[PDB]
């Protein structure tokens, strides 16, 4: 019967000067034993709010915590560029202590189409007997973008993995990379490799591609 601490929204896109609230809800009473933490990627959590409503030190006046019954809320009164991080609620009313699962607070940007780049395997890597095709979506917004792998105009599935960056510091864009992995047997067994990118900033899906060696 641990106390659960259900936090929402899990993600949040705002621009600067926006009011932002991050609610959290205790499944039991936790009195005011509720803290708020900030975390930025690869760093430790910062204490922000203790005892449900009191600022820890070096927290500036735009932060604020409040309680109603079991409903606790962090509130940024007017969001500042420093303030785009993850936020966790924690209850310390009984053991075991539990955290909220987090709220990710992202910057709102103008829409930007990606610039697509496609990379064949290397000569080194095919001497290794396995082939990897890599496609590069670069500096787009928002995050949403579908990459489709067609081989000789045949859609692939299961044989690709993707990964995205965090919002850039300079221009708040993203980047995604997709990797199709094949047998060296299967890489040579086909002639056309295509990378299909559908995205909001594209009026029509940009698709880049290569054939064999095409030196």
């Amino acid at each position: 019967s641990d106390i659960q601490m259900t936090q929402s929204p899990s993600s949040l896109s705002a621009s600067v000067g926006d009011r932002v609230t991050i609610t959290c809800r205790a499944s039991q009473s936790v009195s005011s034993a509720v803290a708020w933490y900030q975390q930025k990627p690869g760093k430790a959590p910062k204490l922000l709010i203790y005892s449900a409503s009191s600022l820890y030190s070096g927290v500036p006046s735009r932060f604020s915590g409040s309680r109603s019954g079991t409903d606790f809320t962090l509130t940024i009164s007017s969001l500042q560029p420093e303030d785009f991080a993850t936020y966790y609620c924690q209850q310390s009313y009984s053991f075991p202590s539990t955290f909220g699962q987090g709220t990710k607070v992202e910057i709102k940007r103008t829409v930007a189409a990606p610039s697509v780049f496609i990379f064949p395997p290397s000569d080194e890597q095919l001497k290794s007997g396995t082939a990897s095709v890599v496609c590069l979506l670069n500096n787009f917004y928002p995050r949403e973008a579908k990459v489709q792998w067609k081989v000789d105009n045949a859609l692939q599935s299961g044989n690709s993995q993707e990964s995205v960056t965090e919002q850039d510091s300079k221009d708040s864009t993203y980047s995604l990379s997709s990797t199709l992995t094949l047998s060296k047997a299967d890489y040579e067994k086909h002639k056309v490799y295509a990378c299909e990118v559908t995205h909001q900033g594209l009026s029509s899906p940009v698709t880049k591609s290569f054939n064999r060696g095409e030196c």
């Binding site: 641990d2 975390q39 990379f119 290397s122 890597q125 990964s163």
Partner: protein, 226 residues
Amino acid sequence: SEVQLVESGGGLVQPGGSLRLSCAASGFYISYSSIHWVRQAPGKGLEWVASISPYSGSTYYADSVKGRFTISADTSKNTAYLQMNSLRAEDTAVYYCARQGYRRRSGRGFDYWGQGTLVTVSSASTKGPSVFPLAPSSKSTSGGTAALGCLVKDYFPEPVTVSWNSGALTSGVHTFPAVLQSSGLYSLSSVVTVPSSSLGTQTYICNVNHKPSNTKVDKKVEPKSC
């Protein structure tokens, strides 16, 4: 900010193995405070593990680690310990020690946090990364810029450092998160964009540094043509 917690003792372990983290207090005496361990699985949120309270030495544990882990403090060495026994894979996380602040200044807030040590629980084995170039293309370059990159593949465990041309060229670069792949080996690629005018005028070399296997690899990236 003379108050500081310094962690150590993590690393890579077979499942069922053991590992002993230690948190080194300086700036305060540990015996006057509750000490907490909070782990963070890669890609996930904060999970509370254990604590020990002052004056009583009472210890508390998450259900998930209850009986395998054992928290303690050596008050003469002013440090806290976490004895992890019979590790399971999902014990993999960055582990943090946190100081619980004073009842009448910060409630039960954790006001000073460790730094994290990474603990991995794997029956996999160390493997340096194979580095392959992502060769810039035919450089048709309607926008006057091309992308070149390094695929860093089949490596274990994390992390990997990637720098381009030994610290220079920090601009345009994007190193991506690694992905766990079917083999159980991680792979990531790092990419930089650059004006395609200096394509050939300047040559580009990523510096892949994988300390867990002691591989320090450099690869030149350029096209091949006819």
